Design an enzyme around this catalytic site. Structure first.
Site, PDB file in Angstrom:
ATOM      1  N   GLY A 145       5.358   3.657 -14.884  1.00  0.00           N
ATOM      2  CA  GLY A 145       5.897   4.177 -13.465  1.00  0.00           C
ATOM      3  C   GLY A 145       5.020   3.611 -12.425  1.00  0.00           C
TER       4      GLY A 145
ATOM      5  CG  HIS B 189      -0.434  10.054 -11.149  1.00  0.00           C
ATOM      6  ND1 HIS B 189      -0.609  10.886 -12.195  1.00  0.00           N
ATOM      7  CD2 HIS B 189      -0.723   8.908 -11.837  1.00  0.00           C
ATOM      8  CE1 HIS B 189      -1.342  10.438 -13.132  1.00  0.00           C
ATOM      9  NE2 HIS B 189      -1.368   8.996 -12.976  1.00  0.00           N
ATOM     10  CD  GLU B 190      -0.243   5.469 -10.041  1.00  0.00           C
ATOM     11  OE1 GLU B 190      -1.270   5.385 -10.399  1.00  0.00           O
ATOM     12  OE2 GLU B 190       0.713   5.984 -10.920  1.00  0.00           O
TER      13      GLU B 190
ATOM     14  CG  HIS C 181      -5.539   7.361 -10.913  1.00  0.00           C
ATOM     15  ND1 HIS C 181      -6.256   7.921 -12.151  1.00  0.00           N
ATOM     16  CD2 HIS C 181      -4.217   7.268 -11.682  1.00  0.00           C
ATOM     17  CE1 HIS C 181      -5.656   8.006 -13.173  1.00  0.00           C
ATOM     18  NE2 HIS C 181      -4.305   7.728 -12.640  1.00  0.00           N
TER      19      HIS C 181
ATOM     20  CD  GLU D 282      -4.966   2.143 -17.054  1.00  0.00           C
ATOM     21  OE1 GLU D 282      -4.501   2.286 -15.892  1.00  0.00           O
ATOM     22  OE2 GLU D 282      -5.369   3.354 -17.878  1.00  0.00           O
TER      23      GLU D 282
HETATM   24  O1  LIG Z   1       3.525   5.189 -15.086  1.00  0.00           O
HETATM   25  C1  LIG Z   1       2.878   6.054 -16.010  1.00  0.00           C
HETATM   26  N1  LIG Z   1       3.645   6.967 -16.893  1.00  0.00           N
HETATM   27  C2  LIG Z   1       3.018   7.837 -17.824  1.00  0.00           C
HETATM   28  C3  LIG Z   1       3.877   8.989 -18.505  1.00  0.00           C
HETATM   29  C4  LIG Z   1       3.426   9.430 -19.686  1.00  0.00           C
HETATM   30  C5  LIG Z   1       2.370   7.902 -20.181  1.00  0.00           C
HETATM   31  C6  LIG Z   1       2.584   7.077 -18.901  1.00  0.00           C
HETATM   32  N2  LIG Z   1       1.386   6.101 -16.213  1.00  0.00           N
HETATM   33  C7  LIG Z   1       0.561   5.508 -15.561  1.00  0.00           C
HETATM   34  C8  LIG Z   1      -0.643   5.871 -14.675  1.00  0.00           C
HETATM   35  O2  LIG Z   1      -1.225   6.666 -15.401  1.00  0.00           O
HETATM   36  N3  LIG Z   1      -0.943   5.464 -13.453  1.00  0.00           N
HETATM   37  O3  LIG Z   1      -1.895   5.967 -12.716  1.00  0.00           O
HETATM   38  C9  LIG Z   1       0.290   3.903 -16.471  1.00  0.00           C
HETATM   39  C10 LIG Z   1       0.496   4.092 -17.642  1.00  0.00           C
HETATM   40  C11 LIG Z   1       0.313   2.646 -18.393  1.00  0.00           C
HETATM   41  C12 LIG Z   1      -0.180   1.760 -17.810  1.00  0.00           C
HETATM   42  C13 LIG Z   1      -0.236   0.515 -19.027  1.00  0.00           C
HETATM   43  C14 LIG Z   1      -0.846   0.591 -20.056  1.00  0.00           C
HETATM   44  C15 LIG Z   1      -0.970  -0.532 -20.683  1.00  0.00           C
HETATM   45  F1  LIG Z   1      -1.704  -0.587 -22.055  1.00  0.00           F
HETATM   46  C16 LIG Z   1      -0.342  -1.569 -20.538  1.00  0.00           C
HETATM   47  F2  LIG Z   1      -0.220  -2.825 -21.344  1.00  0.00           F
HETATM   48  C17 LIG Z   1       0.804  -1.731 -19.462  1.00  0.00           C
HETATM   49  F3  LIG Z   1       1.347  -2.782 -19.200  1.00  0.00           F
HETATM   50  C18 LIG Z   1       0.667  -0.561 -18.503  1.00  0.00           C
HETATM   51  C19 LIG Z   1      -0.117   1.754 -16.508  1.00  0.00           C
HETATM   52  C20 LIG Z   1       0.037   2.884 -15.898  1.00  0.00           C
HETATM   53 ZN   LIG Z   2      -2.403   7.659 -13.820  1.00  0.00          ZN
END
Ligand SMILES: O=C(NC1CCCC1)N[C@@H](C(=O)NO)c1ccc(-c2cc(F)c(F)c(F)c2)cc1
Ligand SMILES: [Zn+2]
Ligand SMILES: [Mg+2]
Ligand SMILES: [Mg+2]
Ligand SMILES: [Mg+2]
Ligand SMILES: [Mg+2]
Length: 889
Positions: free
Chosen positions: A265, A301-302, A305, A124
């Site tokens: 995360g 959270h995961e 999903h 993602e």
């Molecule tokens: O961890 C999180 N924290 C949240 C807190 C406020 C915003 C983020 N968010 C999760 C999530 O939503 N998991 O379900 C998550 C977020 C971004 C990615 C991601 C996207 C990309 F374009 C990448 F290039 C990449 F390397 C990673 C994968 C997972």
């Molecule tokens: Zn998420």
């Protein structure tokens, strides 16, 4: 620089029905063979076949097992593989390719990469194209058949999505595993993991179908003893989706895997959730208390999903808040139920109104469903996530639990197994709304403005009470400031959960009531109100808005002491603090500006101090809530209320207010710090990783908050308590002892002691780094240099870099040093990090988000550093796009 527009969505002219992958991991490279079984869609108009493919080394490509020739039949420019339409078949065909990629040197942590000795993927949003050619967009749903091969000694554990259907030996010390995943999925949910992984496992039996689900949690061997809480949280998450939403897991196995190097995360790859180790691993000896709520919420959270994101997925990336806002909302319902502490909801509001409100009043402001993007890696924002979650939560407030559950099930039943859009969810909620209102003419058309309108609404109040008529009126108005996204802002559907408190006895005067404000202003009248109430407004923080309650401090104190709603009590305290902060700030500012030799400061309200003491001394009151009331509002909350904020004047303002209250309450604070010890630090369950007591952790939060206040105050002989605190088995306590010793000669003694306690656990060392980084030290710049030379060095681990630098950036007095030396330091770190990890480099830009809210000298200093970063010839797409938006270029 390609801009993608939400209105431009159109289905592909192609279909990918089946993906068959062979991923062969070798010492110096990884070979990826892929066959795509494809077809021509009804939208095809004879266009070229264009695949995404970024950084791939082509060995060969073929169509229907006929090798294609570069230049004649295809071009590749390291971003797009173009097959000229005259060579594209007109019916079902197979496209195949073999490419070479290099996970060992993939320090951006997107695509396939190596984290320590684990090979792991992160796809993602558009990372799958860094592994092989694809039409890399989430509406291209396909079946996946994946074989992974690797050296058996280095990589004994092989994992991907779906069922493991074969394991086999390979000459030369290698082995393979084949995974078949028949359900359709978008490619961003593909994952693969290879490593010398160790695990804990359990079996979960689902509530209704009674299916046996195998649960596995994995880490490197060194940290396998830190897996137990995560497994417990996974079981809890499964039970909650079953109990609240009636939703059961559909697969035979769910794997969770911790890796040391991760950009965020965690990630919800189907059946193979991958986590930042700091969000999966904990033990009581080696983790601070915060880890336990963190793992609970991130595992939850995961897991949530699996329905809201995986089984119902996204048509396009503009719908991101449909899966993230809704999953954060599900995560927050879950965490509130598991912790049974009011500070869980308060902590979410506190984050929203500091970090997200700042974003929404910054040049980066966007609606939760933006109209355009350049970088998907910059799209994952607190606006999309946390304001998204509040927008998803408002449906529950509007409908109530029974009809919300009915509408949510309509959403799941109608869209299970398909892509979906924000409209699909609003439609499902609207059906429930018609049922609740018994009115098939009722609609939620206005609600959709929550998805398109940027900025934080302001809601203000006026009251009227007629004692003879026993009639009470609440006049409400809403206003959103125009911004770069909408010149004219429309009124929103704002639900206002309200109570009316009788000021003579503290009791509720009406039943639960949610006012539905749908116009720019409205007057809500209540009859049979026997006495003039104090209104309790936006209970539970019922809409993501600036609340202007127009109450006196006397009224706010009465709510703080006697209201039934934790948020309104907390907000009333916040509002009393803010009135004091703004007053003293202006008094200090005037003295600075006019160069006064003497001046007056308005003291803290004595009845407010009395009320704090009253709540602190209440043995039945909640320890976590107590820790909030003795803490001033976050700096990033305060800054939304001050133009041209002089950070030194604000630091002086906070100092005066803390000293005013401490001069009255320090003896109360000390007495509580001592009396809380027995229950807060109880070791009965220190060696039971399954036993987590959120009330007890809140008692430690209170003790550690009071210790900080007492140490800054130089309370008599508090150093003795600090030294004894350093001997506590709980890392939250002994890392606190380091922080609070900053005000004493023993700081570097405790620095060395706690370093020695921390250095042999990777995650604990990162918590130690954060503690040093946030230490209130006059020599913090020298200390940071020491961390750089002795501990951090040239680590590319995002957890290490973020630990060293981000806490320091919240040091109001030192990061904002008028020389600009703190801005210069973080800009150097950003530019250095951008060479290998643009996503994390943009994360490190966070302190600059408020640049245009500071005093004019600091605005100039920050802008100079951002322009310097923008002039770097090698600047990444991510960082350039972000800084151009942030500086209004
Ligand atoms: O961890 C999180 N924290 C949240 C807190 C406020 C915003 C983020 N968010 C999760 C999530 O939503 N998991 O379900 C998550 C977020 C971004 C990615 C991601 C996207 C990309 F374009 C990448 F290039 C990449 F390397 C990673 C994968 C997972
Ligand atoms: Zn998420
Ligand atoms: Mg490459
Ligand atoms: Mg159950
Ligand atoms: Mg969360
Ligand atoms: Mg390391």
């Amino acid at each position: 620089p390609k801009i993608h527009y939400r209105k431009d969505y159109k289905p592909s002219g192609f279909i990918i029905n089946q993906v068959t992958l062979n991923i062969n991991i070798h010492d110096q490279e990884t070979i990826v063979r892929s066959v795509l079984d494809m077809d021509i869609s009804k939208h095809n108009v004879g266009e070229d076949l264009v695949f995404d493919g970024v950084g791939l080394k082509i060995n060969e490509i073929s169509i229907n097992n006929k090798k294609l020739v570069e230049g004649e039949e295809y071009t590749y420019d390291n971003e797009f593989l173009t097959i000229f339409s005259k060579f594209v078949p007109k019916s079902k065909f197979a496209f195949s390719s073999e490419v070479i990629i290099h996970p060992e040197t993939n320090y951006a942590l997107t695509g396939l990469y190596k984290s320590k000795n684990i090979i792991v993927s992160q796809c993602e949003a558009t990372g799958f194209r860094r592994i092989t050619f694809f039409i890399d967009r989430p509406d291209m749903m396909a079946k996946y058949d994946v074989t992974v091969t690797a050296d058996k000694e280095k990589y004994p554990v092989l994992l991907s999505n779906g069922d493991k259907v074969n394991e086999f030996e390979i000459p030369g010390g290698r082995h393979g595993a084949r995974f078949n995943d028949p359900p359709l999925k978008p490619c961003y949910l593909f994952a693969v993991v290879a490593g010398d992984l160790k695990h804990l496992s359990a079996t979960y039996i689902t509530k209704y179908t009674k299916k046996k689900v195998e649960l596995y949690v994995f880490s490197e061997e060194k940290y396998v003893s830190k897996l137990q809480w995560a497994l417990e949280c996974l079981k809890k998450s499964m039970a909650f989706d079953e109990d609240y939403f009636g939703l059961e897991y559909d697969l035979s196995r769910l794997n969770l895997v911790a890796v040391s190097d991760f950009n965020v995360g965690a990630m919800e790859n189907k059946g193979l959730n991958i986590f930042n180790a700091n969000s999966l691993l904990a033990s009581k000896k080696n983790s601070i208390d915060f880890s336990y709520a963190r793992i609970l919420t991130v595992v939850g959270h995961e897991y949530f999903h699996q329905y809201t994101g995986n089984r119902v997925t996204l048509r396009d990336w503009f719908q991101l808040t449909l899966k993230e806002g809704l999953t954060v909302h599900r995560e927050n319902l879950f965490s509130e139920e598991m912790t049974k502490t009011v500070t869980t909801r308060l902590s979410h509001v506190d984050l929203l109104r500091s970090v997200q409100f700042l974003e929404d009043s910054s040049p980066l402001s966007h609606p939760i469903r933006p109209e355009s993007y350049v970088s998907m890696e910059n799209f994952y924002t607190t606006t999309v996530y946390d304001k998204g979650s509040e927008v998803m939560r408002m449906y529950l407030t509007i409908l109530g639990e029974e009809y919300y559950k009915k509408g949510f099930d309509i959403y799941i039943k109608k869209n299970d197994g398909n892509t979906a859009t924000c409209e699909d969810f609003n439609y499902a909620m609207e059906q429930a709304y018609k049922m609740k209102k018994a009115d098939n003419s009722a609609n939620l058309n206005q609600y959709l403005l929550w998805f398109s309108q940027s900025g934080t609404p302001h809601v203000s109040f006026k009251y009227n009470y007629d004692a003879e008529k026993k009639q009470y009126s609440i006049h409400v108005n809403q206003y959103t400031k125009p911004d770069e996204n909408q010149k004219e802002k429309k009124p929103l559907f704002i639900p206002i959960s309200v109570g009316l408190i009788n000021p003579e006895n503290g009791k509720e005067m009406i039943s639960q009531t949610t006012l539905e404000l749908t116009k720019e202003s409205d007057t809500f009248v209540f009859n049979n109100i026997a006495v003039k109430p104090i209104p309790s407004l936006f209970r539970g923080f019922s809409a993501p808005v600036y609340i202007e309650d127009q109450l006196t401090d006397e009224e706010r104190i009465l709510l703080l002491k006697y209201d039934s709603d934790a948020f309104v009590r907390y907000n009333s305290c916040t509002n009393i603090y803010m009135k004091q902060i703004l007053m003293n700030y202006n008094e200090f500012l005037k003295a600075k500006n006019e160069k006064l030799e003497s001046f007056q400061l308005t003291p803290v309200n004595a009845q407010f101090i009395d009320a704090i003491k009253y709540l602190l001394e209440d043995p039945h009151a909640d320890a976590g809530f107590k820790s909030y009331i003795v803490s001033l509002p976050q700096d990033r909350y305060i800054i939304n209320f001050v133009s041209n904020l002089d950070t030194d004047v604000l630091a002086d303002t906070k100092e005066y207010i803390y000293k005013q209250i401490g001069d009255k309450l320090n003896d109360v604070y000390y007495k509580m710090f001592k009396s809380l010890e027995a229950k807060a630090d109880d070791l009965t369950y220190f060696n039971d990783e399954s036993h987590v007591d959120f009330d007890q952790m809140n008692m430690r939060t209170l003790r550690n908050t009071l210790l900080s206040l007492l140490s800054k105050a130089q309370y008599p002989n508090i150093l003795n308590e600090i030294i004894e605190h350093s001997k506590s088995p709980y890392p939250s306590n002994w890392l606190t002892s380091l922080s609070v010793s900053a005000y004493f000669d023993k700081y570097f003694e405790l620095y060395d002691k706690t370093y020695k306690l921390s250095k042999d656990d990777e995650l604990l060392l990162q918590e130690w780094l954060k503690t040093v980084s946030r230490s209130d030290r006059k020599d913090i710049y020298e200390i940071l240099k020491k961390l750089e030379n002795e501990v951090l060095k040239d680590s590319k681990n995002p957890n290490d870099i973020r630990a060293v630098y981000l806490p320091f950036t919240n040091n109001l007095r030192r990061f904002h040093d008028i020389s600009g030396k703190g801005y210069k330091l973080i800009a150097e770190v950003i530019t250095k990090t951008d060479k290998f990890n643009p996503m994390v480099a943009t994360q490190l830009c966070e302190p600059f988000k408020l640049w245009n809210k500071l005093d004019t000298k600091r605005q100039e200093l920050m802008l100079n550093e951002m322009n310097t970063m923008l002039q770097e010839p090698q600047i990444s797409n991510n960082l350039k796009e972000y800084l151009l938006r942030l500086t209004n270029k």
